[PDB]
């Protein structure tokens, strides 16, 4: 393994040389269309989205109704629920909004609290929801996956990104 | 060298027809791999034009 022997070997080399798994495309996916998103909508909420909605003082369900021009159904999982519960006292009013009979709790079977992994598993397994967030790396992840409606918070209200039915 | 065995009739037609089929498939496989390599080199030129 001497270096000059390696030198001779690379010169000889240059002189001589000179069960799998494929996840299916979803049946509800025309080329980038995602025709399966019709009213009523089914949306998925993030802690960042909650706290920034408090900051911009917008109403949650009224805000998504006026932004999306129809009826919409809100969902949070146990990962983001435990994430709010971990944030705790300063966001106790955020917990008070997150506990509501109008928001429908969705269960999960996960080990840890990585709501990023939880939600990205959800969207990689379903492709029927609308994600509502503010986070940058997760935003880039849901951007690099195609055919899915991102809605972020910013400015005076919410903003939709990928839904073709903007109006 | 090959083994020298005499064959009569039907088996000679079997080997002749099956070597016809082998040469057909050899030509078709060579055509598939040349078309595939041409697609690779054009894809590589377009990847270069898009990276730079």
């Amino acid at each position: 393994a001497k270096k000059t022997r390696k030198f001779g070997l690379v010169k000889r080399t240059l002189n001589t040389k000179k069960t799998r798994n494929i996840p299916q495309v979803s049946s509800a996916l025309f080329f980038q269309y995602n025709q399966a998103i019709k009213p009523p909508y089914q949306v998925l909420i993030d802690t960042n989205f909650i706290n920034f909605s408090i900051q911009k003082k917008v109403d949650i369900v009224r805000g998504m109704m006026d932004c999306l021009l129809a009826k919409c159904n809100p969902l949070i999982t146990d990962c983001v629920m435990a994430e709010l519960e971990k944030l705790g006292p300063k966001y106790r009013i955020a917990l008070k909004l997150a506990r509501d009979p109008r928001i429908k709790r969705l269960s999960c079977s996960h080990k840890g609290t990585y709501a990023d992994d939880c939600l990205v598993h959800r969207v990689l397994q379903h492709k029927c929801y609308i994600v509502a967030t503010n986070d940058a790396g997760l935003k880039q992840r849901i951007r690099k996956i195609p055919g899915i409606p991102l809605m972020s918070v910013g400015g005076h209200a919410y903003v939709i990104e990928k839904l073709p039915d903007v109006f | 060298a090959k083994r020298a065995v005499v064959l009569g009739g039907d088996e000679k037609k079997a080997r002749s027809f099956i070597q016809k089929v082998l040469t057909i498939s050899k030509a078709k496989d060579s055509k598939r791999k040349e078309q595939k390599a041409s697609q690779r080199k054009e894809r590589l030129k377009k990847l270069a034009k898009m990276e730079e």
Partner: peptide, 28 residues
């Protein structure tokens, strides 16, 4: 091949250093 011919190194020991017309074909 010319380079390997120059550096043959003639002291290598490898263990593998110890190993009618149709009528004639039918015979053989």
């Amino acid at each position: 091949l010319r380079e390997k011919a120059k550096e043959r190194n003639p002291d290598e020991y490898y263990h593998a250093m110890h190993s009618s017309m149709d009528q004639v074909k039918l015979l053989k």
